[PDB]
Amino acid sequence: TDLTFFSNGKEYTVTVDKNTTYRDLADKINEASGGEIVAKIVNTGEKGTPY
Amino acid sequence: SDNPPASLTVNSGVALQSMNINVTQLAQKDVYQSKGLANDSGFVNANLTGT
Amino acid sequence: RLTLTSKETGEDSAISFYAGKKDAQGQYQSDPEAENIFSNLGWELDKTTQTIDPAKDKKGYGIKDASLHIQTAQNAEFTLDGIKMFRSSNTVTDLGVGMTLTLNKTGEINFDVQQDFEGVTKAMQDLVDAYNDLVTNLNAATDYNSETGTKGTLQGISEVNSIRSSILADLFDSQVVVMLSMQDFGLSLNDAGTLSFDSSKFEQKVKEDPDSTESFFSNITEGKGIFSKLKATLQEMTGKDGSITKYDESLTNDIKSL
């Protein structure tokens, strides 16, 4: 599939496969969108590490 | 302002950024103050026979 | 009154002072009523009824004995960009890479990380000062003195003139766009010994675009930057096989033969 984004009239697309991981996703987002779209994982400070 | 509610220390080499931080509660410890008020630190409960 | 508190902070540090005679995991005693402790220093707020069974794991039962709980352990509560964050202690060391947060009180704060490059002014000042003193010494070494007492003491030695001219060149040197000349950032390259460092221009042009400046001055080690050429030139001069040693060795052997 293709994660198609639209920021300030600028389109950005990211392909996703079966092996998708949140880290892989964030990296693909921050790379396809060359810094325009910020992607980052935060280790929520709760009991189940609800990232 | 005058009194920083929290202090952020940053080492060298870290990239530039800005942090919107809000604090709502401080970390605490559990406190227990005995209500049994003895007028002598050398109070001995002799009826506690055995161990 | 006996005060009992946890050494650590955070709700997980909860303590239960249990009168069980090793009822917990040594051997099940089913909470024996040891008179003194059970009557003065039991510390489960309101437990005489066996609400918390002394299981094997998290064995924290106790007695209703005496007091009302005074202060409850808490986990610090943060909000980073709308993200609710909680930790055990007031000290947050994992906020980010190379950053440490210390907590004092609640409220809202807006921090901003900026690059601190104030030392560049001191750097340029020290460099210009050292160069001024060195070139003054060199001129005084080969200055023509109408008193004739030291008129051209080391005159005829091309070392001094080569050094002065070469450093002046490397300083006046530049690359094509990238600084066109040192005077681009306020380094007013004046005559020998009259160099001046216009802090205003340097600070302004660096604050306007620190990235281009950092790039051109990190090229120093391709297009090797400005001060790299000096590091090479002065190295060839002061090197053990450099010209300075040539003149020195010639003069040193001269006295032997003499």
The answer to whether the Cβ–Cβ distance between B18 and C110 falls below 8 Å is yes
* DSSP line for chain C: --EEE-SS-SGGG---B--SSSTTTTS-------HHHHHH--BSTT-SS--S---SSS-------S----B--B-EEEEETTEEEEESSSEEEEEETTEEEEE-S-EEEEEEE----THHHHHHHHHHHHHHHHHHHHHHHS---TT-SSTTTTTT-HHHHHHHHHHHHHHH-------SSGGGGTEE--STT--EE-HHHHHHHHHH-HHHHHHHHHS------HHHHHHHHHHHHHSTTSHHHHHHHHHHHHHHH-
Q: Do C73 and B29 touch (CB under 8 A)?
A: yes
The answer to whether A44 contacts C94, with C-beta atoms less than 8 Å apart, is no
Residues 30-89 of chain C whose Cβ lies under 8 A from any Cβ of chain A: 75, 78, 80, 83-87
Residues 54 to 93 of C: which have CB under 8 A from any B CB?
Answer: 65-82, 87-90
Burial class (CB in 10 A: 0-12, 13-18, 19+), C53: exposed
Mutate to test the interface with C, among B28, B35, B40, B44 (most CBs of C within 10 A): B28
Residues of B in contact with C89 (CB under 8 A): 27
Yes or no, beta carbons of C78 and B38 under 8 Å apart: no
Residue B30, classed as helix, strand or coil, is: coil
Side chain identity, residue C62: G
At C51, the amino acid letter reads T
Q: Are C225 and C217 in contact (CB under 8 A)?
A: yes
Residue of C nearest to B14 (CA): C98
Alpha-carbon distance of A4 to A29, in angstroms, equals 10
Q: Min CA distance, B44 vs chain C (Å)?
A: 9
C12 min Cα distance to partner chain A (Å): 11
* One-character DSSP codes across C225-240: -HHHHHHHHHHHHHST
What is the side-by-side order of every strand in the sheet holding C99-103?
Answer: B6-10, C99-103, C91-96
State the structure-solving technique. Answer: cryo-EM
Chain B hits for C34, Cβ within 8 Å: 48
Q: Is C6 exposed, middle or buried (0-12, 13-18, 19+ CB in 10 A)?
A: middle
Resolution (Å units): 4.7
For residue C116, give the amino acid letter: D
Q: Do C87 and A45 touch (CB under 8 A)?
A: yes
Which residues in C lie closer than 8 A to residue A43 (C-beta atoms)?
Answer: 94
Give the HSE-up count for residue B2: Cα atoms under 13 Å, Cβ half-sphere. Answer: 0
Name the neighbours of C, counting chains with at least 3 Cβ pairs within 8 A: A, B
Contact of C39 with chain B, judged by CB distance below 8 Å, is answered with yes
